[PDB]
Design a protein around this ligand. Structure first.
Ligand SMILES: [Cl-]
Ligand SMILES: [Cl-]
Lengths: 150, 151
């Protein structure tokens, strides 16, 4: 569409950041969520290893992703890790997620990165077929382990 | 072996050990036509406050190690830690070394008040798959890894 706009957040974009987090809360159906203080979120937004992309309709965030820079020891060309990606259920399928991926990969290409990667749950068929629609270089079935700390 | 082994988190002046671990990675992962980055680059990476390396030592020889990245969260003030690579010397595999590395790493991030540490293994790597399972993770999950090689 011509009205939709993809933008990368900056220092004074905390309100848009919070709006995206609220979208994440909604789409991911997170329970009993308590958003961190704005002081914390502001400092994170200011990190040079963290970049947020959103899809906007006028003032309304209808989609977004978060990404982390991982400097490599194999190469002087860093990696980018897309951690979260969501599209508002009322705008799911508008080309939004593709536009976000394209913007993100172009951004890291300009910065001389080697590779961008992202994970989707095996049971999440909507995301699974979405990422395949973005034509990634490759996909690999893997297993994710995590240790909840005391 | 346990009373010979040393598990440690690398310090600022441990670039030689870092390079040794990278070389171990090159061999264990069977990386082809690898060219190690300049030492200035590796030193700066080692010194990053969001990157920590844990190694296993016998005298001066690295026999195993892992690399970890701190990921500050927007869901919580408690960060995440991402274990990116883990390898053990093929002649020393499955003698508790990998378990000790995971234990040390998780203890470090637990003390720092992190929410969780996570790590991934290939579906076909049953060596790795049931190693991590032997470490008693809180949960495991089937996922698909997508990547985009940039021009
Ligand atoms: Cl809240
Ligand atoms: Cl930039």
């Amino acid at each position: 569409d011509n009205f939709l706009k993809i933008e990368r957040l900056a220092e004074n974009d905390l309100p848009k950041f919070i709006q995206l987090i609220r979208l994440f809360e909604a789409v991911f159906e997170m329970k009993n969520f308590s958003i961190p203080d704005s002081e914390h979120l502001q400092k994170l937004l200011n990190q040079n290893n963290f970049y947020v992309f959103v899809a906007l309709l006028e003032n309304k965030i209808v989609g977004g992703l978060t990404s982390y820079v991982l400097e490599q020891y194999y190469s002087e060309k860093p990696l980018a890790y897309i951690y979260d990606l969501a599209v508002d259920t009322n705008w799911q399928r508008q080309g939004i997620g593709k536009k976000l991926i394209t913007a993100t990969n172009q951004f890291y290409t300009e910065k001389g990165f080697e590779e961008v990667f992202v994970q989707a749950d095996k049971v999440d068929d909507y995301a699974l077929d979405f990422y395949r629609s973005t034509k990634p270089t490759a996909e690999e079935q893997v297993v994710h382990f995590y240790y909840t700390l005391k």
